[PDB]
Amino acid sequence: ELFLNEYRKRINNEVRRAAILTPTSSLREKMNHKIADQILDLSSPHVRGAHFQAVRSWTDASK
């Protein structure tokens, strides 16, 4: 759970890096290339985030 949260934090840090190294004139294209898909992959159901409990079935916990 902490590792999935680490994934989300790393993708957020890379978005912050893109916000600085890339001007707004072309940031959204490069972000929609690969980063946006991973951001939506690491979202509220897929990672616990700030939630009290990550509601996983036993199969999901085993995975």
Binding site: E1, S44, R48, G49, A50, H51, F52, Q53
Partner: protein
């Protein structure tokens, strides 16, 4: 104290989920905050021989250290981000918002606005004003013991935010 204790007890209603962390942190924070607030009440009652708002006011002008301690206690109690009350509120309220957003807003509205407004009203009226009556019996400033106890409470509430995040 009742409000803070009920908020902490709320965090333990989800079993052993990632909600007990906020409960532990809020337990420590409320311990130090209640100690500081009751110590301030003790100082006021030992100085002015009263605790009611209608009998003592204008503490900041006769006992400046006590008034400053009261004001900074209110600042710390208002959940300033630098301290650990803000961390505990963040934990519990994030968990409750993901659990129940409307109940989280209701709890934050009643606790952090109405309760805070009343709490500050009863303390701001004591801190400010004119201590006109009983000038012959007006007390002195804070001693080194009380000053250092208050400073230690502030120091813990500030520096405990830098404790290792492994256990939080």
């Amino acid at each position: 104290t009742i409000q803070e204790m009920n908020i902490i007890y709320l965090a333990f209603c989800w079993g052993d989920s990632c909600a007990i962390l906020g409960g532990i942190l809020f337990s420590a924070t409320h311990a130090f905050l209640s100690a500081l607030m009751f110590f301030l009440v003790d100082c006021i009652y030992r100085r002015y021989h009263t605790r009611s708002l209608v009998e003592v006011n204008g503490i900041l002008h006769i006992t400046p250290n006590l008034g400053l301690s009261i004001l900074f206690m209110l600042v710390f109690f208002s959940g300033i981000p630098g301290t650990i009350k803000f961390i505990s509120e963040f934990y519990i309220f994030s968990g409750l918002l993901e659990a129940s957003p409307f109940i989280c807003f209701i709890l934050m509205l009643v606790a952090n606005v109405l309760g805070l407004i009343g709490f500050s009203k009863s303390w701001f009226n004591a801190t400010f004003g004119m201590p006109k009556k009983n000038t012959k019996y007006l007390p002195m400033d804070l001693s080194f013991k009380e000053s250092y106890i208050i400073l230690y409470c502030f120091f813990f509430l500030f520096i405990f935010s830098y404790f290792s995040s492994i256990f939080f």
